[PDB]
Amino acid sequence: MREYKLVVVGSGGVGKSALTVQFVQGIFVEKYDPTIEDSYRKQVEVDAQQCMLEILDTAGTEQFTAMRDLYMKNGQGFALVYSITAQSTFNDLQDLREQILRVKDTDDVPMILVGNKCDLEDERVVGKEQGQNLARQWSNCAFLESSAKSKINVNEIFYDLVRQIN
Ligand SMILES: Nc1nc2c(ncn2[C@@H]2O[C@H](COP(=O)(O)OP(=O)(O)NP(=O)(O)O)[C@@H](O)[C@H]2O)c(=O)[nH]1
Ligand SMILES: [Mg+2]
């Protein structure tokens, strides 16, 4: 079966691990905090085509990891995750995307912008329109707001990222 190597990236605390585990295992991590940059596997069907996904849950950008350029070079698609409750995590993604494009030496990289923690509407600081315009600035319409906690758009992040690699 075709296998896709996906990479979830973003600043600390945005819910990279929570999204990955919710998608792959169907459970919410609550306060459990994985300390390994591990890979998580799930078979999916997207547009009537079967795919094995292997999803790498990376450390927050501000944390040490010597493997970063390896994952940026080798990953087939990237989920760039921020929290809607922290503008810094959103702005951080501009530099992050630039780093990925630099490592790959091309603009043509499957990517989805993900505003996580959308269940925290009362704590929102990043407007949905901000996310939409960032996507527009990137010339890539793939943008979702998600909640790992409430299971909103979690599967769709990965399905939509697969659509781009296909
Ligand atoms: N309300 C809410 N909380 C969330 C969501 N996702 C994650 N969290 C919470 O946010 C905290 C950090 O989540 P986690 O998945 O560990 O984030 P991370 O991006 O993997 N952090 P790190 O970069 O350090 O590995 C946890 O308390 C977690 O329960 C969400 O969609 N909604
Ligand atoms: Mg994590």
Side-chain angles (χ1 to χ4, degrees), residues 50-106:
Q50 295 177 87
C51 340
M52 171 54 79
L53 303 186
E54 185 167 301
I55 302 160
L56 180 67
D57 175 29
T58 69
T61 303
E62 75 287 337
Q63 306 156 41
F64 178 85
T65 283
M67 296 277 294
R68 202 82 85 206
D69 276 24
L70 209 56
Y71 305 153
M72 290 188 165
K73 187 55 170 293
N74 290 273
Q76 289 176 287
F78 299 81
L80 272 63
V81 186
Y82 66 100
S83 171
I84 69 158
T85 69
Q87 185 72 229
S88 63
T89 70
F90 179 76
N91 292 328
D92 287 345
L93 294 181
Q94 176 76 349
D95 285 345
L96 189 49
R97 177 170 176 280
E98 289 184 24
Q99 177 53 20
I100 295 164
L101 306 187
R102 176 184 176 177
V103 170
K104 294 254 189 218
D105 199 39
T106 178

Side-chain angles (χ1 to χ4, degrees), residues 10-20 28-34 57-63 81 116-120 146-151:
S11 297
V14 300
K16 298 181 299 297
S17 295
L19 285 166
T20 300
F28 183 56
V29 292
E30 303 283 356
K31 303 302 188 179
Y32 193 72
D33 190 353
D57 175 29
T58 69
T61 303
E62 75 287 337
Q63 306 156 41
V81 186
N116 192 44
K117 310 199 181 184
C118 76
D119 58 287
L120 301 181
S146 64
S147 174
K149 178 172 173 62
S150 301
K151 300 185 188 178

